[PDB]
Design a protein around this ligand. Sequence first.
Ligand SMILES: Nc1nc2c(ncn2[C@@H]2O[C@H](COP(=O)(O)OP(=O)(O)OP(=O)(O)O)[C@@H](O)[C@H]2O)c(=O)[nH]1
Ligand SMILES: Nc1ncnc2c1ncn2[C@@H]1O[C@H](COP(=O)(O)OP(=O)(O)CP(=O)(O)O)[C@@H](O)[C@H]1O
Ligand SMILES: Nc1ncnc2c1ncn2[C@@H]1O[C@H](COP(=O)(O)OP(=O)(O)CP(=O)(O)O)[C@@H](O)[C@H]1O
Ligand SMILES: Nc1nc2c(ncn2[C@@H]2O[C@H](COP(=O)(O)OP(=O)(O)O)[C@@H](O)[C@H]2O)c(=O)[nH]1
Ligand SMILES: [Mg+2]
Ligand SMILES: [Mg+2]
Ligand SMILES: [Mg+2]
Lengths: 425, 430, 317, 346
Amino acid sequence: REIVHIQAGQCGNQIGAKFWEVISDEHGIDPTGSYHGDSDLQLERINVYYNEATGNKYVPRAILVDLEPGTMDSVRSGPFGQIFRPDNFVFGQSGAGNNWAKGHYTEGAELVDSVLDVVRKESESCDCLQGFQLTHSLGGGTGSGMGTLLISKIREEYPDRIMNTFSVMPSPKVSDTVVEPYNATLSVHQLVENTDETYCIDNEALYDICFRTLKLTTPTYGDLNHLVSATMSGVTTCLRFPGQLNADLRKLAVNMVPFPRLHFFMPGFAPLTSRGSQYRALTVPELTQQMFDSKNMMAACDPRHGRYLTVAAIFRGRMSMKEVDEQMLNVQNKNSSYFVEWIPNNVKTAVCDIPPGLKMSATFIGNSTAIQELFKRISEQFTAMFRRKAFLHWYTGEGMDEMEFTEAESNMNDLVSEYQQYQDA
Amino acid sequence: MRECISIHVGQAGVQIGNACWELYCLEHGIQPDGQMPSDDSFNTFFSETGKHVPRAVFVDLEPTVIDEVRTGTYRQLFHPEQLITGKEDAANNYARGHYTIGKEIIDLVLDRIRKLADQCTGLQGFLVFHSFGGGTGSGFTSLLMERLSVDYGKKSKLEFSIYPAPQVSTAVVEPYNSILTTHTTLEHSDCAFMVDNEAIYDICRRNLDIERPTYTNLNRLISQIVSSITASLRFDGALNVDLTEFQTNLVPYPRIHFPLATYAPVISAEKAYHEQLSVAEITNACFEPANQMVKCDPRHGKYMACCLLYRGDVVPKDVNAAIATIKTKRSIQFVDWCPTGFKVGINYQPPTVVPGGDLAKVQRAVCMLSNTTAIAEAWARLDHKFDLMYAKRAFVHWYVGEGMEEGEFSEAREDMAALEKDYEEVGVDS
Amino acid sequence: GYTFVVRDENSSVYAEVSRLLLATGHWKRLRRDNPRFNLMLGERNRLPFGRLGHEPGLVQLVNYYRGADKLCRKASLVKLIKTSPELAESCTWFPESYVIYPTTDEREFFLASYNRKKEDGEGNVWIAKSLISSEASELLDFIDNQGQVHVIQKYLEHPLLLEPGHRKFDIRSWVLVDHQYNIYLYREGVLRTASEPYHVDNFQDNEMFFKEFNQYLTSALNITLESSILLQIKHIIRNCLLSVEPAISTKHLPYQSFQLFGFDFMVDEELKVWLIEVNGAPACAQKLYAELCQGIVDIAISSVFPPPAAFIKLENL
Amino acid sequence: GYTFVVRDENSSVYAEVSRLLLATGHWKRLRRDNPRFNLMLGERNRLPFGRLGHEPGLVQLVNYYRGADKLCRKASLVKLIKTSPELAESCTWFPESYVIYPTTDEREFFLASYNRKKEDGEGNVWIAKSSGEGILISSEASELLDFIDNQGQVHVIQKYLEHPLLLEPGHRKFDIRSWVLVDHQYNIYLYREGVLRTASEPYHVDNFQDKTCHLTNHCIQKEYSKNYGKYEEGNEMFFKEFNQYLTSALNITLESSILLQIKHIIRNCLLSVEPAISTKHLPYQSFQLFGFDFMVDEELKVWLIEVNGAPACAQKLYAELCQGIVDIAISSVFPPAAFIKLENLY
Ligand SMILES: Nc1nc2c(ncn2[C@@H]2O[C@H](COP(=O)(O)OP(=O)(O)OP(=O)(O)O)[C@@H](O)[C@H]2O)c(=O)[nH]1
Ligand SMILES: Nc1ncnc2c1ncn2[C@@H]1O[C@H](COP(=O)(O)OP(=O)(O)CP(=O)(O)O)[C@@H](O)[C@H]1O
Ligand SMILES: Nc1ncnc2c1ncn2[C@@H]1O[C@H](COP(=O)(O)OP(=O)(O)CP(=O)(O)O)[C@@H](O)[C@H]1O
Ligand SMILES: Nc1nc2c(ncn2[C@@H]2O[C@H](COP(=O)(O)OP(=O)(O)O)[C@@H](O)[C@H]2O)c(=O)[nH]1
Ligand SMILES: [Mg+2]
Ligand SMILES: [Mg+2]
Ligand SMILES: [Mg+2]
């Protein structure tokens, strides 16, 4: 059961490169692609993310996309840069200028067919393809515009497969341009229609965690990417190691998505580490309380402001399964109002013996109605500019029409009202 | 691989161009003969042979001024074909520069520019330097911009426009030329940085203690501000933010493309005192009207964008702390439709000064680019002077005599009236 | 020599000021758009401040301070009181106000404060201005049925009532801020009194001077105008003008500014002065026009362009 | 499993806080100078703020706010009131004060103010105090200035409150002490219970050498007042007895007549120094217990006199105050109606 990984744009390639470095270490794969691990329980499901090449080499089933060579040249030089298939680097020369329209309609449309040729080649060499996972940001131009363009084209060619994304939401606290609410709203509109599951990784939440919790006053993208790669590792553990719960993308979607449009997940992680941090190993009760706390959410939403439709918890490392079950049952009994009563047993728990890194950790995946706070924040920012048609010339100049913006704004407002409807049920 | 061609039109554009390229050479360790012993990001502005040659074109309808370049210290720097001259100037007349004399030299200019474009693997656009007041600076530039929009459709075109000041003005009709050129060039310019000669003049008198500043004094200070703006294109780093990324934030509406530049510190080379100047001190100076490139009151104008470009010993921690202090202490009001945030860029390369110059060498410096409605005061002053003369049709015969019509005058003035109204509307709350 | 322009014929105050300048023999009046002036008696809206002080050699002064409308417009004054560092925590003299937009927007905060008052049995009368009611539902509907931004201020239900008549009144004080920012309170104020008795239920409803008002205060309450009301007034004026001082100061500008302000106060039954509104272009009382306009000529105009005891300079401690 | 260090054995308040942290599993007391702590109950002077929060694994919190001295020192408080934008024009609750240096001096301004009241026949009694010992109350500027020059320390000439609120029976002077706890998120908490450091001698306006009626300092009353503890134990009246005297003799509650002004002053004072002392941009978190000293005049107006960075509590209030410090400031950062949270109206 193979997954085809695609990473697009600066953010998509930076978080994507970290994800591959992290899991390559976990699976005992070195930068040359050779296996040198101390367990085989690393190679049991290695084929989910890696292909097997000539001299017993494991090659990531990853496709690196960007309209600018810069970020991809940085990857090719980084630690695990040589692990990727050289043919799978697909890049243009004229970037996207943080413009969704350029990535989706003009610059991106010129490069998209060559990317699909690589996607097709990777798919044809799959015994049984489960689907695709895309890493990207929604505030830029390549990952946002060209990424959603790729999703649309892939869906047309593989309508019966799962489309999963790790989508980095933009925030004024960690911003590159004022047009981020435009790019994000346009991308969310695409995501609501063409993805089965999206992990909402909020830069606002990643910033507040680094600043308020870790006390990293003046955090860098590297600091935010430390949390991201750790969360990405946790949420994909069930797909990379032998397990019974959410072992593939489809079963995960069936367990987590009660309504087709409501597929935006709020990840959580514990303990919150800081690059090069100190000594203790968090008890099971401590892991559980933290992963459910607003301060550990990777989306800037207060779960106490909504209700959980479904939840998937994953514990990693050697620990008491009896204690895990007691702690998991306790969080629900102590906060039963924040879990919808009309979805019985909506909190599932998995445990993996192999820890990340750390001695023991816990990853949370929640489909909460509080996620509307993220879409409300973006919608507010989008409307503040769209109301006065600010910066629209950059988009209309690429061929886009104002009607397209009105539809994206409306679809996202509908998404918010749908999340609110199920919160009042 | 994104190259940038600079075009310097008329006396002001040429003389300012000489100062910028002199500074760029000092910044990149390039000798007057083009040789660079240290030898890339600087290739956006320089082509290589081991001679590093500016991707620039100098144009003037009269040979004295460019002839000084041809025989000066940097004569070897440029290729002869890059220095283009006519015989008869535009006589401070927009109509002569755009029509009568402009038609005669335009095709040659476009060819010399084409020769530079052909050496570019990925041309990003043009930077056009010119005055509003001169006949060539106003007239020929707008003709050039019109033709460039045709020959290079997409490509970006940025301007550095020298706004007229009575202290150094050489013509009574500069207001006419200013309105005419602004009108004609408006659709063809993506971003324009106005440099008020009065503001640069007053900074030289105050901050540099110069009794009667000369063009050399003005141009060296102008070159520092221009250098800060183009530093992101000539250098690269993790904290370096590209100018086009700032330009996305700087221009909310196509017509409102005139950012206000403020620079700090401007310290006398003899009265330097040895003080270091914190990140907090220079950042605060960006909000002192005395340091702006255009005379206006930003306190009474709404911001649509604010960008901070730091140049020397600067770390983010200090920048964020300085911005935090400036907030809740300054008259920084944004329009309700723009996020009240500052886009920051840092270039670790410290500022360079010309040896034997009026400016002291500093450890750190900052240039702020802000799109404020306060810059519309500069249009109001110009439009008022235009109105005073045009009411009586004074000097209009000089323009009509070169084929122009009174219709172009009122059409250009009506466009300026609309521009002043656009700045008024963009400040009104939603 | 000195030349001046008049760009506001509707201003009654500066019409008298213009006459006084012409009477001296030192001042000549130029046409409306003549830019070679020394003094500009500009227009109320859209004054061309950007064109001022740029003609070389000329010393230019304007009868308005650019900005100041941040203290004069009702919504901006509410914004200034609640957000200025100098006022946010120290202001105890401005009635509880919320800026309500009809079509940023403190509607949710007003409803929280209204519900806090009805639960505790506290006075809940509010006044909406661009309607006096104790309901808030009909107050909000009144705002939405108008294309203007309104402010919901707490209505002063217990005002100081003048006897005889048992009637409501408000105080108007004239403040002249010259160039270099010296605040001058004009000695004479006016009481815009009501000629009907006060009712605490009927929501459907004359110039006393400081000598007659001083005489009413002793004998009526045995207290003087000062130490009970005039000290409060002076404190409020000082705090208000100094909060906006860094945003409107002309010290780093090519021209100089001066402005006459109209401060409106309301005294409650405990003798506490409350600031209601500030006026950028106020109108004077008929008998005080000659003295006030002469004071503007001497303090603000003659200080910049050179040819008593009626203006108290407000200073701190 | 949290760890704490105690670097001030003289602090009676944090000695009780230390005992409350122990005997409740969760806390272990580490050796002094051990840098692997979670909470630091630091020293009064020269606290090592620079070394705090530099271990990227543990969360560090200190019982003091760096820079609080710009409010808690006699001369710096006078400087803050007169120069802060938030206070310079709005402050009507701080007695007219001038910083004086003996052989940034405001000596010339004091003489101008002294001469202005003298010519107008206004009250001219002033009190001089060093930054109870070295305090002179006099209506002669010549006598006051000479007193400063003799001692080798910076003094502050404050306007003496000639008409204070006198407690009956006894007709005696008093001052109010309020305990304010500011947590890691700068939430200001006023401790419900306050103390009245009362005098046990009848107050008179003429003889300033009688320090038992003019100075309400607890040490002055025990060492010189012959009636020490005559009206209340240790010359300390609590808010129940004071509220009962107010509601009876003057027909007004303590909450409305005095506590509203107290709450206003506290919030204005701590928020004026907030941007200069906030640990939002610092690797560690701060919290501090302050001791606000007030004086009420006969017209029931509250006047701020001093702010104490390291205050001492009243014997009966130690248990409740120290438990409040453990719950609000320590347990909020390190988790296992007696404190009013002071907030702005809007
Ligand atoms: N800062 C600066 N301003 C200059 C310089 N040279 C001229 N100016 C200004 O530019 C305006 C005049 O334009 P010029 O550039 O002299 O004219 P031109 O483009 O050569 O045009 P013609 O001579 O009419 O053909 C006036 O406002 C001058 O003050 C210069 O070197 N520096
Ligand atoms: N809060 C309040 N309490 C009592 N009377 C008030 C009041 N607000 C306004 N008034 C009365 O209503 C009149 C309305 O005057 P006007 O409409 O010119 O503005 P104003 O001075 O009331 C402005 P603001 O919105 O700041 O209260 C005032 O002159 C005063 O007599
Ligand atoms: N302006 C003033 N008006 C009236 N009484 C005052 C006063 N300033 C001080 N006092 C009296 O003097 C006492 C001591 O004041 P001060 O401010 O010096 O005390 P403190 O607790 O800060 C320490 P120290 O022991 O150094 O005096 C006060 O408690 C009060 O009784
Ligand atoms: N977490 C994270 N966010 C990033 C990173 N790089 C950029 N971003 C965010 O992504 C957006 C910009 O998109 P980017 O990937 O840079 O551009 P693209 O090349 O057009 O896809 C903004 O919202 C940034 O805050 C990164 O490495 N990590
Ligand atoms: Mg991306
Ligand atoms: Mg993107
Ligand atoms: Mg010329």
